[PDB]
Amino acid sequence: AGDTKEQRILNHVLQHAEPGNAQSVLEAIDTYCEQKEWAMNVGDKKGKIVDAVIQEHQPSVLLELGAYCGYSAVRMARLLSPGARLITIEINPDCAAITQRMVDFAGVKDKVTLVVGASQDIIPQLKKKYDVDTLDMVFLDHWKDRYLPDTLLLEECGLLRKGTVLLADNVICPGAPDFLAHVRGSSCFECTHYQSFLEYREVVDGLEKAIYKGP
Ligand SMILES: C[S@@+](CC[C@H](N)C(=O)[O-])C[C@H]1O[C@@H](n2cnc3c(N)ncnc32)[C@H](O)[C@@H]1O
Ligand SMILES: Cn1c(-c2cccc(-c3ccccc3)c2)ncc(O)c1=O
Ligand SMILES: [Mg+2]
């Protein structure tokens, strides 16, 4: 179509990336967003921090909040082992449609379960509908005012265990100070900050890793 920025990001990938080649898809999205239209993909610089977290902790059951065009889903899915699952939750059904196409194009279809709906509604269904016991890792990257209540909801729903890894993008810009005060101030988390930059910009941003210690 070319009507929305999201459709234009996808079109660019369709025109320039190699199918089945996750790295190719990510480079194409990053190039377009660096050069033509800024978009809220975690991007390549903060992407390397995301990579490093996945490579250290090696999650088999991963949850992502906020899928957008599929950039981070592809980024994380490409590093996952055979049999590993990425469940990604996306509120905007038009973003979701782009994400499925992006994931299919990149060759990581079988790693990904895309769910359309609000994280606050879908999180408490994970046990009942999606075969989840507890989560290995969660990537928080949706509207920043949802970080705190969704972390509280994840805990309450029984989805965190000793060693569950939370990784939150944008804890500086646009920021999530209430979420940070909670995880850093609670003895139930061990936290690490990764200072970086907002995607495609020179504005300072950061990620926070928070490891659940158990209740
Ligand atoms: C930063 S974008 C996601 C970017 C993506 N993680 C990446 O790096 O490629 C934020 C997304 O979260 C979605 N979102 C916002 N609130 C949500 C919620 N409560 N539940 C699920 N998705 C939500 C928005 O529609 C938007 O697509
Ligand atoms: C979501 N997001 C955004 C973004 C873009 C528009 C609005 C909001 C938002 C909405 C409500 C409360 C707080 C923030 C956030 N910018 C950069 C990212 O990397 C990202 O993941
Ligand atoms: Mg982000």
From Swiss-Prot:
Native source species: Homo sapiens
Entry comment describing in which tissues the protein is expressed: Brain, liver, placenta, lymphocytes and erythrocytes.
Taxonomy of the source species: Eukaryota, Metazoa, Chordata, Craniata, Vertebrata
Binding site for Mg(2+): D141, D169, N170
Protein's name according to its UniProt entry: Catechol O-methyltransferase
Disorder noted: Schizophrenia: A complex, multifactorial psychotic disorder or group of disorders characterized by disturbances in the form and content of thought (e.g. delusions, hallucinations), in mood (e.g. inappropriate affect), in sense of self and relationship to the external world (e.g. loss of ego boundaries, withdrawal), and in behavior (e.g bizarre or apparently purposeless behavior). Although it affects emotions, it is distinguished from mood disorders in which such disturbances are primary.
GO biological process: artery development; behavioral fear response; catecholamine catabolic process; cellular response to cocaine; cellular response to phosphate starvation; cerebellar cortex morphogenesis; cholesterol efflux; detection of temperature stimulus involved in sensory perception of pain
Family membership: Belongs to the class I-like SAM-binding methyltransferase superfamily. Cation-dependent O-methyltransferase family.
Residues that, per the record, bind substrate: K144, N170, E199
GO cellular component: axon; cytosol; dendrite; extracellular exosome; intracellular membrane-bounded organelle; membrane; plasma membrane; synapse
Co-factor: note: Binds 1 Mg(2+) ion per subunit.
Catalytic activity: a catechol + S-adenosyl-L-methionine = a guaiacol + S-adenosyl-L-homocysteine + H(+); 2-hydroxyestrone + S-adenosyl-L-methionine = 2-hydroxy-3-methoxy-estrone + S-adenosyl-L-homocysteine + H(+); 4-hydroxyestrone + S-adenosyl-L-methionine = 4-methoxyestrone + S-adenosyl-L-homocysteine + H(+); 2-hydroxyestrone + S-adenosyl-L-methionine = 2-methoxyestrone + S-adenosyl-L-homocysteine + H(+)
Portion of the parent chain present: 52 to 265 of 271
Cofactor: Mg(2+)
Effect recorded for A22S: Correlated with reduced enzyme activity; associated with increased risk for schizophrenia
Extracellular topological segments: 2-215
E.C. designation(s): 2.1.1.6
Biological function: Catalyzes the O-methylation, and thereby the inactivation, of catecholamine neurotransmitters and catechol hormones. Also shortens the biological half-lives of certain neuroactive drugs, like L-DOPA, alpha-methyl DOPA and isoproterenol.
Enzyme class (EC, first level): transferase
Molecular function GO terms recorded: catechol O-methyltransferase activity; magnesium ion binding; methyltransferase activity; O-methyltransferase activity
Modifications after synthesis and translation: The N-terminus is blocked.
Binding site for S-adenosyl-L-methionine: V42, E64, S72, E90, I91, G117, A118, S119, Q120, D141
Keyword terms, alphabetized: Catecholamine metabolism, Cell membrane, Cytoplasm, Lipid metabolism, Magnesium, Membrane, Metal-binding, Methyltransferase, Neurotransmitter degradation, Phosphoprotein, S-adenosyl-L-methionine, Schizophrenia, Signal-anchor, Transferase, Transmembrane, Transmembrane helix
